[PDB]
């Protein structure tokens, strides 16, 4: 049905798993994938190879709804993060630009114990 | 402030009374507007229909103003803060420039000598009354109408308030003293500030008379009666309800919701 060639793609890479969601120019998703969306399940989902496979499987679906160029936007450290970007530039999408918007408190609310290892 | 007493008697050990700083310099109520004799009477056409009500000090009624939009634009000076037997909040007698006098349920902060006024024009300060639209989103406010021109229904218990939460067309979102979130019409007036005499919650009645002075008769437990008398009633020596707690009338009283399902009041409420 609907098609747009110029959209936008968000990369969530956690220390566990990497998941890409592709949107329109104002952020309303068109499709997504992730290390779970591939045959991988568990802590292999956090692997960069899976972040790739996702990134391709993700792109490949957007193309089908007319996609060609997208702006890339990352949030959060994680093995698979880099391979994710890499996997999109050489893929058939024109990575019109990249941003990092990993969110980060200005000394916000107290984190869990595991994270509060920073004294 | 709550006076606490020394224990020169049991019971007078736990009893605490109000400060009356509150009101000072005015006790005898306003013969003029104030009084209609109030009618004690704990039921309708014969039968008691609120149990345990009766006795308690003979009491005169003060006729307050719950619709301030009569006097739009006319300011009045706050003339005195006086005692009201008929409600938890205290009341303020205020003389309008108009000559005319009336009693408002006295909001917190309010002090003898202040001038106070109601209208869309009014300054956004204590005791002044205004449509809800012309009141800034965030302020607390009490003595709120619910439908326009129907009189102040919300937030009049001692130390109560509501807070303006948002706008929405002719309507305006309100967080109630309960915690409920309700749209109320923009034209529904409300008086800026909260209610005051907010120590009221902390009176420790102190003994069982007193409870009587306030006209509250003793309340006999369910089990404590016999089966004719009540659902819990019965049982040889002392008993454990025997499923699941119930009013005298039988309907369940632990957790059962009672408000009418298809009420058109719905769609306006959200908590």
């Amino acid at each position: 049905k609907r098609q747009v060639a110029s959209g936008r793609a968000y990369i969530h890479a956690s220390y566990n798993n990497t998941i890409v969601t592709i949107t329109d120019p104002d952020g309303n998703p068109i499709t997504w994938s992730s290390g779970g969306v591939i045959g991988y399940k568990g802590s292999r989902k956090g692997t960069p190879y899976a972040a790739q496979l996702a990134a391709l499987d993700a792109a490949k679906k957007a193309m089908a709804y007319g996609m060609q160029s997208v702006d890339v936007i990352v949030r959060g450290t994680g093995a698979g993060r880099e391979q994710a970007i890499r996997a999109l530039q050489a893929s058939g999408l024109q990575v019109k630009s990249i941003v990092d918007d990993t969110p980060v408190p200005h000394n916000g609310c107290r984190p869990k114990k595991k994270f509060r290892k920073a004294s | 402030a709550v006076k606490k007493f020394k224990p020169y008697t049991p019971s007078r050990r736990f009893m605490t009374v109000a400060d009356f700083s509150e009101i000072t310099k005015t006790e005898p109520e306003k013969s003029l507007v104030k009084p209609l004799k109030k009618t004690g009477g704990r039921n309708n056409q014969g039968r008691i229909t609120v149990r345990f009500r009766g006795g308690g000090h003979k009491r005169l009624y003060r006729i307050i103003d719950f619709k301030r939009w009569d006097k739009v634009g006319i300011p009045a000076k706050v003339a005195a803060i006086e005692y009201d037997p008929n409600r938890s909040a205290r009341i303020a007698l205020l003389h309008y420039v108009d000559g005319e006098k009336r009693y408002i349920i006295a909001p917190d902060g309010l002090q003898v000598g202040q001038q106070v006024v109601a209208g869309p024009d009014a300054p956004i300060q204590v005791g002044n009354a205004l449509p809800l639209r012309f009141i800034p989103v965030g302020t607390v406010v009490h003595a709120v109408e619910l439908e326009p021109k129907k009189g102040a229904k919300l937030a009049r218990a001692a130390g109560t308030s509501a807070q303006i939460q948002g706008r929405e067309g002719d309507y305006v979102i309100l967080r109630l003293p309960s915690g409920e979130l309700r749209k109320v019409h923009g034209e529904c007036y409300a008086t800026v500030g909260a209610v005051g005499n907010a120590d009221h919650k902390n009176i420790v009645l102190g003994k069982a008379g007193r409870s009587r002075w306030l006209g509250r008769r003793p309340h006999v437990r369910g089990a404590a009666m016999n089966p004719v008398d009540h659902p819990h009633g019965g049982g040889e020596g002392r008993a454990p309800r025997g499923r699941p707690p119930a009013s005298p009338w039988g309907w369940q009283t632990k957790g059962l919701k009672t408000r009418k399902r298809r009420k058109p009041s719905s769609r306006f409420i959200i908590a």
Binding site: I98, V99, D100, D101 | -
Partner: protein, 70 residues
């Protein structure tokens, strides 16, 4: 490379409204910059930041900006 105090003239680090002067003290992450980069003194770097903060609060300076091509 570039020390930022040396790259301006006489300037009043007390003015929480010289956006142009101040803008240059703010990374491309919007952060306050260190003395490793401003090259203000101790005492300066303070009377600086305090005004940088204010200016953020006035709506002149960003508290943070996100990071363009990384």
């Amino acid at each position: 490379k570039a020390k930022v105090k040396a790259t301006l003239g006489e300037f009043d680090l007390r003015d929480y409204r010289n956006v142009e002067v101040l803008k240059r003290f703010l990374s491309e992450t919007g952060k306050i910059l260190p003395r490793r980069r401003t090259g203000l003194s101790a005492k300066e770097q303070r009377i600086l930041a305090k005004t940088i903060k204010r200016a953020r609060i006035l709506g002149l300076l960003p508290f943070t900006e996100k990071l363009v091509r990384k």
